[PDB]
Design a protein around this ligand. Structure first.
Ligand code: DGD
Ligand code: CLA
Ligand code: CLA
Ligand code: CLA
Ligand code: CLA
Ligand code: CLA
Ligand code: CLA
Ligand code: LMG
Ligand code: BCR
Ligand code: BCR
Ligand code: LMT
Ligand code: OEC
Ligand code: CL
Ligand code: FE2
Lengths: 35, 82, 137, 340, 32, 335, 447
């Protein structure tokens, strides 16, 4: 078939996918903070 | 059993996808990392740094004690080098 | 709010003279304190005899005084009772009894100074917590 | 008319059905989940409970949480642009604005979601018993995260969003409300525990009373997605239980309605109990018991024992659990048994 | 007085139990 | 007579008995009757029990000042520990009721029978030509009773430490447990509540979905239940309409369409979850407790920065410090 | 060869129920994983092992198993030579490759079936003779093994005896209890408090002795099965199929798993407190010892001391009259141990020995074991759930006991599961009720 790209599903998927990775990256950095 | 959306399977397999996401995914990652590692996050959320819970001597807690003048009261807590 | 060298300045001997530990010695002491003390002295108390703690004041009224590097170090070599009128190296870890308390074998004069320093620095940081028990947890 | 066109678009059968409801559901539901995930990793509870509560401070998935606002705030809605935060974001965070954010948002998100069920049901033309059922979880959220603290001094005594931060909510209710001794809480557990039984028992009863509709051992493929005959011997099941338990179903329509009733009725009862705990109208004691315990020093029941456990919980926790009260309990006033 | 009340209800539930198991409505197949 | 014993075995095993007294039943039926009869008498008229072995009798029966909610059958003495205490081990019944004798007679007979009850849940399934495994679902609730009535006592060194047989007595078991093991902070318990919460959830899920997608065969003023006859050929609900709705609630592939895969999940979830909860009590019976994050996060100077994990510890100390008032003589609670 | 038209993917290994050859690869590849672990773990343990420090304080569970067999240790469990540890570790690690080879081979190259490629090895599940015979082979292999221990103890060096007269030490057993009345006596022992059944073994003579009996009795049965077939009842009682046999062995391991849990938790002899930690009761006993010892030095008369309840702060009586330690520790009055025995008299703890025969090595032993009870958290924080972080420790006895109860349990479920399937498989309905001939429908209504 001739499927589209940007769809509603796409939007949704990204609202959760994009922040997640941004957080997983943030957290991953925290593993090195100390005192 | 179907709707307009392009079957994930195809996309997660399309070399185009990875050519895009090999850039996009690590990008977001390195961004968030920097968000923490540059100390920016600490200021965006007023979260104390390991050396900012108490003043050197003080062992008391900066408990906010009144609603309306809270913000003002909070600011003063940062004053005592807390 | 940090472990400044101001906090790492603890009394060296009975005659007021002091010594200043370094963040390296501290951590090292803390590690050694866990390796051979925590077992019975976790958090400044004494599980096998709760009447005597590691509070600086308690160590001050000890006999001889054990509230300084010199004091604690001697103790870790030849331990005595609170009045000092009796040596207890046979039922207390020490250098002269490492055969009986293997954990004390490795321990060298460097290690003993760190452990001693740790005991005097902790209460400076934790305060009341260090001496008391579950009440302060 | 645009309306019917707006409608048309919304009610379109996509991968993730939107619908009118979605206009309420998705905005909130995402903000609620988002705010938690935000606070969980970045915002602190220092200025609010004198507690580290985020990954950024060193907390792990268990110890992390979005803690309630100060007790000073009272029942304030704590709007980002309200008298407290004054439009400022950072301050808002430090005053526990993220709690009322997650709470109120998530609250509407549950309204939207039930509406969705209602809306989707209608379209697909099925009965809304999925909506009726979902009333139970609402009641719980409403009574515990809203009605309860609304009866207390402030939001500070509402359960903080987090794993560990919820365990203390449990321990608190024991120590202070003697919640386990409450008739409504009991019914509660009777429903959830009993509901988790029906689940298990019915499932197992079906899988082991199945007809053979295939030649393989893995009988999963052997199922007709397009109705027709019953996939399991309802007649055999009946006889089984009728001989091992003495009682047994025999009307799948009732057996299934029962499965809705039990856990939904349970949660409803557990809610009422808390709605009473808001006003502190608890089921703390049995007067006849206390009176005999006073006059007679040798009378001891597992009940009296428990109350002493509560006394200890209150005395040893209250100090660091209620900072705004500046409690100072001298070692000598602290209730304690022998040796311990 | 209370003891009596507690035991009574209990005794009543057990009575029910009996009747429920041995005096139910026989479960009839197909032609019901 | 075709042969007495041959007949006997044919009766016992007979699938024409109102209640299937099986082979396992031959052990079950007597053991369960002893347990129940002893219980009922104990709970109503038994006298005070010195549970903690410190001569401080705890009365838990109705006739001795208790009501349904507080009353219980008190665990055997701590002086007895794990020793076997059958009636014939006492100078008199008076001594036996004082040392919590009834408790053992009850727990042992119950656990015994409740096991055979599982064995029976297989037997009848065999005699009826249906697949087994139902008894395997019942293995979870049983494995709990075992964990709570036998494993924990063996582990802790005394039956006096087993869960009492009563409402309030059970709450005691919990509150104290938490204090000594911090169970809420243990993976196995969390999986347990996941299974139980989930169970109730799914129980409501299934229950609703199905009842809501029933094919109409009833009047507007007639019970929707009558639309089903015991011994039907075809199904009584539109599992395709059910899946159609639920598939739209979340999203298609996150919804069941196979009744068999549905019902397996429906059974698998709680049983597996409860299995772990049972393994939790059985593991913490050897003092491998929940996570201890006390004084974990500390600041740059060394100060202790509390977390909710610490606030939990205070609540725990209160329980610790107050339970069994007069039973401790020494610093550490190692029993 | 085998795919979905056999079993489902997640039940894959059941497609090998009738492929003797490949089903051998599994067992030979698997047995490699066990050897691999044992070896690779030993080396991991040794790599971290610190000689001048208790084993129980280092998370060891294999090195202490070797130590028990008298290897690399001496007086009081003192570690002398770490070579035997390194050896046992590396040897295994190697043999894992050899076995692993065979495993991989038989499962992807060699014959997919055995029956034809050699009728001696090929087998038939229902072949009651081949089964009793293969079983007979293994019953001998295990029997020799049981004797392999008796040899090490009597000839090749000995075992670690904590009860050693001069105090814990490697001792050569040269007098195994062979008296059946005693040996088999254990099996007739109660499993409750006091009489502890098998776990009550308290000296190496019985251990070594008992093993002699097992070694023989086992090989004896090994031959008997080679030379026989199951009788009449033996056949009309059991189910003969590939699964049924599994099940029987599942419940068997389960039972042994529970017995093992109690052994490592209670037993002092075959599990030396010197290498593992102090037993549960041993630690609680040690507290009573410690403080009875302390306060007595402060001038207190332990014999007449009255505690809060009026029971006896330090010493009280058991239900049968013996003098035991007081406090909650009254539940562990069945504890026996090297350090504590010299204080026991003919009536239990002797007030005179306690009053002036307590030795220093005992005081610090009591102190040691008191501060090392088997109490800890998942994240390894030794102490009570309310303790503070610092002492990273969880008794090996706690680890072993819990791990093995979980395994033992699930295996009992495994048993039930495979036994329930076998009975339905046999009779033939493990795949559903015959739509046509529905058994229940031919039975009278009980209603
Ligand atoms: C559905 C799911 C069902 C799950 C069921 C699980 C059941 C598991 C039970 C374990 C099997 C018991 C076998 C065993 O190893 O049994 C052994 C255990 C341990 O017995 C111990 O035996 C003795 C241990 O002595 C040893 O240990 C020291 C004392 O601590 C001393 O130093 C001494 O010298 C040393 O020999 C002591 O008397 C202990 O107090 C204790 O009684 O028995 C016990 O606790 C068990 C108590 C009896 C109940 C078992 C019934 C089985 C049917
Ligand atoms: C579970 C153990 C086991 C069993 C039962 C078998 C069985 C079999 N293997 Mg084999 N194999 C095994 C392990 C095993 N293997 C391992 C670990 C390896 C890797 C080295 C191999 C490698 C292997 C190969 C490469 C081949 C076989 C083959 C065969 C088959 C032909 C028999 C044969 O080789 O005679 C061999 C002759 C013997 C009877 C002599 C063996 C005596 C040895 C040297 C002593 C063993 C000592 C023992 C460990 C201690 C027991 C003593 C104790 C009782 C006192 C047969 C089915 C062959 C096959 O595929 O043909 C169809 C074949 O080519 N196997
Ligand atoms: C549509 C879904 C939705 C809903 C129902 C809510 C609801 C809410 N949000 Mg919200 N929010 C949403 C989406 C949504 N949000 C989105 C997508 C975002 C991201 C941009 C946010 C971001 C956000 C933040 C950052 C905050 C809230 C907050 C709040 C709460 C208080 C706000 C309030 O006072 O509203 C006021 C209600 C109105 C403005 C509705 C007016 C409608 C009328 C008909 C229009 C009339 C206009 C006219 C000029 C008036 C004439 C009168 C004349 C006399 C002047 C409230 C529960 C606050 C909160 O959580 O505090 C704890 C808060 O700080 N939200
Ligand atoms: C003597 C040991 C033993 C043996 C030889 C078998 C053998 C067999 N079992 Mg089995 N079983 C055992 C013990 C054993 N079982 C126990 C103790 C249980 C109780 C849990 C079961 C429960 C069980 C069930 C419920 C079933 C079988 C089945 C089967 C057969 C197909 C195998 C298969 O499904 O593989 C496929 C294997 C899997 C898909 C892997 C499962 C992974 C496990 C569950 C996770 C383990 C957690 C792990 C330790 C954590 C690691 C961390 C990870 C992140 C890396 C096969 C004959 C199946 C059969 O069809 O019946 C005849 C079947 O349905 N078994
Ligand atoms: C104890 C672990 C174990 C073992 C020993 C086996 C063994 C076996 N399984 Mg298996 N299985 C397991 C776990 C295990 N399984 C689990 C957990 C699952 C669930 C996911 C399955 C699911 C499963 C299915 C669905 C099937 C099997 C099958 C088979 C058999 C054929 C092997 C095969 O198909 O080769 C395939 C060959 C390859 C693709 C190469 C694999 C790489 C090799 C084997 C590993 C090499 C090891 C090491 C790295 C090299 C050492 C070399 C060194 C010694 C020099 C074989 C006897 C099949 C069967 O029924 O037999 C016909 C089959 O259909 N298994
Ligand atoms: C079962 C026997 C066993 C036992 C008793 C031990 C015991 C021990 N091991 Mg160990 N180990 C084992 C097997 C065992 N191991 C195996 C098979 C491996 C290979 C992977 C290792 C690898 C290993 C390493 C690499 C290390 C240890 C260490 C240790 C020690 C520290 C314990 C620890 O910190 O636990 C903490 C572990 C946990 C809290 C994880 C619990 C995992 C459970 C079982 C998961 C259950 C989930 C369930 C299966 C999900 C299925 C459900 C699903 C199907 C629905 C301890 C003495 C450490 C040590 O020696 O340092 C002192 C160490 O570094 N072990
Ligand atoms: C572990 C390896 C092993 C295995 C798998 C078998 C397996 C088998 N043997 Mg066997 N056998 C073995 C070792 C083994 N044997 C050894 C070492 C010897 C030498 C002593 C014998 C001697 C032997 C003889 C003399 C006979 C068998 C027979 C049999 C078969 C039927 C047994 C049966 O029906 O039991 C079921 C038994 C019962 C109905 C009695 C149950 C009562 C038990 C024993 C007591 C209760 C158990 C209790 C729970 C455990 C508590 C411990 C207790 C000490 C207190 C069976 C295939 C019989 C056969 O068919 O010959 C070919 C047979 O006549 N075996
Ligand atoms: C060994 C034997 C052990 C004895 C077990 C005793 C079982 C108790 C039976 C109770 C009566 C059940 C009943 O009346 O419903 C009888 C019905 C069966 O009758 C129903 O009739 C029709 C309904 O319109 C349908 O055909 C149904 O399918 C079903 O056939 O059972 C149910 O449907 C409800 C299921 C739940 C049963 C209750 C569980 C029992 C819990 C008891 C807890 C109380 C304990 C108090 C302690 C003091
Ligand atoms: C707040 C706020 C807001 C919002 C924001 C948002 C919306 C956010 C989002 C966010 C997000 C959205 C985030 C996310 C995150 C995530 C994460 C971080 C994850 C992680 C994960 C993991 C880690 C996983 C794990 C696991 C599991 C769980 C299972 C098992 C397996 C595994 C391991 C994989 C706004 C601005 C509006 C306004 C203001 C307020
Ligand atoms: C069948 C199959 C399977 C399985 C497999 C297996 C189970 C295998 C095994 C394997 C094995 C079992 C292997 C082994 C190996 C080993 C080795 C390879 C060894 C090595 C060694 C060495 C090398 C030595 C030495 C040393 C020393 C001495 C010291 C130093 C270090 C070292 C280490 C060097 C699977 C599941 C996959 C899939 C399906 C099929
Ligand atoms: C449905 C209802 C949804 C409502 C969502 C509103 C979200 C935005 O809410 C709005 O945030 C901005 C900050 O970004 C606040 O703005 C605040 O901070 C800015 C600086 O950042 C100040 O210049 C401003 O004076 C102050 O009010 C507004 O006071 C608040 O009303
Ligand atoms: Mn009843 Ca377990 Mn509390 Mn120490 Mn005893
Ligand atoms: Cl209590
Ligand atoms: Fe169903």
């Amino acid at each position: 078939v001739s499927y589209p790209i940007f769809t509603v599903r796409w939007v949704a998927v990204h609202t959760l996918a994009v922040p997640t990775i941004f957080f997983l990256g943030a957290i991953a950095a925290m593993q090195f903070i100390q005192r | 059993g179907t709707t307009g959306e392009r079957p994930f399977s195809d996309i997660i397999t399309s070399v185009r996808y990875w050519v895009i996401h090999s850039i996009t995914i690590p990008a977001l990652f390195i961004a968030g990392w920097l968000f923490v590692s540059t100390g920016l996050a600490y200021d965006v959320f007023g979260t104390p740094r390991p050396d900012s819970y108490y003043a050197q001597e003080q062992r008391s807690i900066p408990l906010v004690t009144d609603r309306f003048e809270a913000k003002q009261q909070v600011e003063t807590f940062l004053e005592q080098l807390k | 709010a940090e472990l400044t060298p101001e906090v790492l300045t603890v009394p060296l001997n009975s005659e007021g003279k002091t010594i200043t530990l370094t963040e390296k010695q501290y951590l090292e002491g803390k590690r050694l304190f866990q390796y051979a003390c925590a077992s019975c002295h976790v958090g400044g108390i004494t599980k096998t005899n709760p009447s005597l703690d590691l509070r600086t004041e308690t160590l001050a009224l000890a006999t001889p005084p054990r509230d300084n590097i010199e004091g604690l170090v001697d103790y870790m070599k030849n331990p005595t009772t609170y009045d000092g009128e009796q040596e207890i190296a046979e039922v207390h870890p020490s250098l002269r009894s490492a055969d009986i308390f293997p954990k004390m074998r490795n321990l060298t004069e460097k290690d003993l100074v760190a452990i001693a320093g740790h005991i005097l620095v902790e209460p400076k940081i934790l305060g009341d917590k260090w001496g008391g028990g579950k009440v302060y947890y | 008319g645009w309306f019917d066109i707006l409608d048309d678009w919304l009610k379109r059968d996509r991968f993730v059905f939107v619908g009118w409801s979605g206009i309420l559901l998705f905005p909130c539901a995402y903000l609620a989940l988002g705010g938690w995930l935000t606070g969980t990793t970045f915002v602190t509870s220092w200025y609010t409970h004198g507690l580290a509560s985020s990954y950024l401070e060193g907390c792990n998935f268990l110890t992390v949480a979005v803690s309630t606002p100060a007790n000073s705030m009272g029942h304030s809605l704590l709007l980002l642009w309200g008298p407290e935060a004054q439009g400022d974001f950072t301050r808002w965070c430090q005053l526990g604005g993220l709690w009322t954010f997650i709470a109120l948002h998530g609250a509407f998100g549950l309204i939207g979601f039930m509406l969705r069920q209602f809306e989707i049901a209608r379209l697909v033309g099925v009965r809304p018993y999925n909506a009726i059922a979902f009333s139970a979880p609402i009641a719980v959220f409403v009574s515990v995260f809203l009605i309860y603290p609304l009866g207390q001094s402030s939001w500070f005594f509402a359960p903080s969003f987090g794993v560990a931060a919820i365990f203390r909510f449990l321990l608190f209710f024991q120590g202070f409300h003697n919640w386990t001794l409450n008739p409504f809480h009991m019914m509660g557990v009777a429903g959830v525990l009993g509901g988790a039984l029906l689940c298990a028992i019915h499932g197992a009863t079906v899988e082991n009373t199945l007809f053979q509709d295939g030649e393989g051992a893995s009988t999963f493929r052997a199922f007709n997605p397009t109705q027709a005959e019953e996939t399991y011997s309802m007649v055999t099941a009946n006889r089984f239980w009728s001989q091992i338990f003495g009682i047994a179903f025999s009307n799948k329509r009732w057996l299934h309605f029962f499965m809705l009733f039990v856990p939904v009725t349970g949660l409803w009862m557990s809610a009422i109990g808390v709605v009473g705990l808001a006003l502190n109208l608890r089921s703390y004691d049995f007067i006849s018991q206390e009176i005999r315990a006073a006059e007679d020093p040798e009378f001891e029941t597992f009940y009296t024992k428990n109350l002493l456990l509560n006394e200890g919980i209150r005395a040893w926790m209250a100090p660091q659990d209620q900072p705004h009260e500046n409690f100072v309990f001298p070692e000598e006033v602290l209730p304690r048994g022998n040796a311990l | 007085m209370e003891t009596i009340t507690y035991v009574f209800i209990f005794a009543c539930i057990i009575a029910l139990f009996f009747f429920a198991i041995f005096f139910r409505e026989p479960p009839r197949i197909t032609k019901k | 007579s075709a042969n007495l014993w041959e007949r006997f075995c044919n009766w016992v095993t007979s699938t024409d008995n109102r209640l299937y007294v099986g082979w396992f039943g031959v052990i079950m039926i007597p053991t369960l009757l002893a347990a129940t009869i002893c219980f009922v008498i104990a709970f109503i008229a038994a006298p005070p029990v010195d549970i903690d072995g410190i001569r401080e009798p705890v009365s838990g029966s109705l006739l001795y000042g208790n009501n349904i909610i507080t009353g219980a059958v008190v665990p055997s003495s701590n002086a007895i520990g794990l020793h076997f205490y059958p009636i014939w081990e006492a100078a008199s019944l008076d001594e036996w009721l004082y040392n919590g004798g009834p408790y053992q007679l009850i727990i042992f007979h119950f656990l015994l029978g409740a096991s055979c009850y599982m064995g029976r849940q297989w037997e009848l399934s065999y005699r009826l030509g249906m697949r087994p495994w139902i008894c395997v679902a019942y293995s979870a609730p049983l494995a709990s009773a075992f964990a709570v009535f036998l494993i924990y006592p063996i582990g802790q060194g005394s039956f006096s430490d087993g869960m009492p047989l009563g409402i309030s007595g059970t709450f005691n078991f919990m509150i104290v447990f938490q204090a000594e093991h911090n169970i809420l902070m243990h993976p196995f318990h969390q999986l347990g509540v996941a299974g139980v919460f989930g169970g109730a959830l799914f129980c409501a899920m299934h229950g609703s979905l199905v009842t809501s997608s029933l094919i109409r065969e009833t009047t507007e003023t007639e019970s929707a239940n009558y639309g089903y006859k015991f011994g039907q050929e075809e199904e009584t609900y539109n599992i395709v309409a059910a899946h159609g709705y639920f598939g739209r609630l979340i999203f298609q592939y996150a919804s069941f369409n196979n009744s068999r895969s549905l019902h397996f999940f429906l059974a698998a979830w709680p049983v597996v979850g409860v299995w772990f909860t049972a393994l939790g009590i059985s593991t913490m019976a050897f003092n491998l407790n929940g996570f201890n994050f006390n004084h974990s996060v500390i600041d740059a100077k060394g100060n202790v920065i509390n977390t909710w994990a610490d606030i939990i510890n205070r609540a725990n100390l209160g329980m610790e410090v107050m339970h069994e008032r007069n039973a401790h003589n020494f610093p550490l609670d190692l029993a | 060869d085998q795919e979905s038209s056999g079993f489902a993917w997640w039940a894959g290994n059941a497609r090998l129920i009738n492929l003797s050859g490949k089903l051998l690869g599994a067992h030979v590849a698997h047995a490699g994983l066990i050897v691999f672990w044992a070896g690779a773990m030993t080396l991991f343990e040794l790599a971290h092992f610190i000689p001048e420090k208790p084993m129980y304080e280092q998370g060891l569970i294999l090195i202490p198993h070797i130590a028990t067999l008298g290897w690399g240790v001496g007086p009081g469990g003192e570690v002398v030579d770490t070579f035997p540890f390194f050896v046992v570790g590396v040897v295994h690690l190697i043999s894992s490759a050899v076995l692993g080879f065979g495993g991989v081979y038989h499962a992807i190259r060699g014959p997919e079936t055995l029956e034809e490629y050699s009728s001696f090895f090929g087998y038939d599940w229902k072949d009651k003779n081949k089964m009793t015979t293969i079983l007979g082979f293994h019953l001998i292999v295990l029997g020799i093994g049981a004797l392999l221990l008796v040899a090490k103890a009597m000839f090749f060096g000995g075992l670690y005896d904590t009860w050693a007269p001069g105090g814990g030490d490697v001792r050569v057993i040269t007098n195994p209890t062979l008296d059946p009345r005693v040996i088999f006596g254990y099996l007739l022992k109660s499993p409750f408090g006091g009489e502890g059944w098998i776990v009550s073994v308290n000296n190496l003579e019985d251990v070594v002795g008992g093993h002699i009996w097992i070694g023989l009795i086992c090989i004896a049965g090994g031959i008997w099965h080679i030379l026989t077939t199951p009788f009449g009842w033996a056949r009309r009682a059991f189910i003969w199929s590939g699964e049924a046999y599994l099940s029987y062995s599942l419940g068997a391991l389960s039972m042994m798993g529970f017995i093992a849990t109690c052994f490592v938790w209670f037993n002092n002899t075959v599990y030396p407190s010197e290498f593992y930690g102090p037993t549960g009761p041993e630690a609680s006993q040690a507290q009573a010892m410690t403080f009875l010892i302390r306060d007595q030095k402060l001038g207190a008369n332990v014999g007449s001391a009255q505690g809060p309840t009026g029971l006896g702060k330090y010493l009280m009586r058991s239900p049968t009259g013996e003098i035991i330690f007081g406090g909650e520790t009254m539940r562990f009055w069945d504890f026996r141990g090297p350090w504590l025995e010299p204080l026991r008299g003919p009536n239990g703890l002797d007030l005179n020995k306690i009053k002036n025969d307590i030795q220093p090595w005992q005081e610090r032993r009591a102190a040691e074991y008191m501060t090392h009870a088997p109490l800890g958290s998942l994240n390894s924080v030794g102490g009570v759930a309310t303790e503070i972080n610092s002492v990273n420790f969880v008794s090996p006895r706690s680890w072993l006991a819990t791990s093995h109860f979980v395994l033992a349990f699930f295996f009992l479920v495994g048993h039930l599961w495979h036994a329930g399937r076998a009975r339905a498989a046999a009779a033939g309905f493990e795949k559903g009720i015959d739509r046509e001939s529905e058994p229940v429908l031919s039975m009278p209504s009980l209603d």
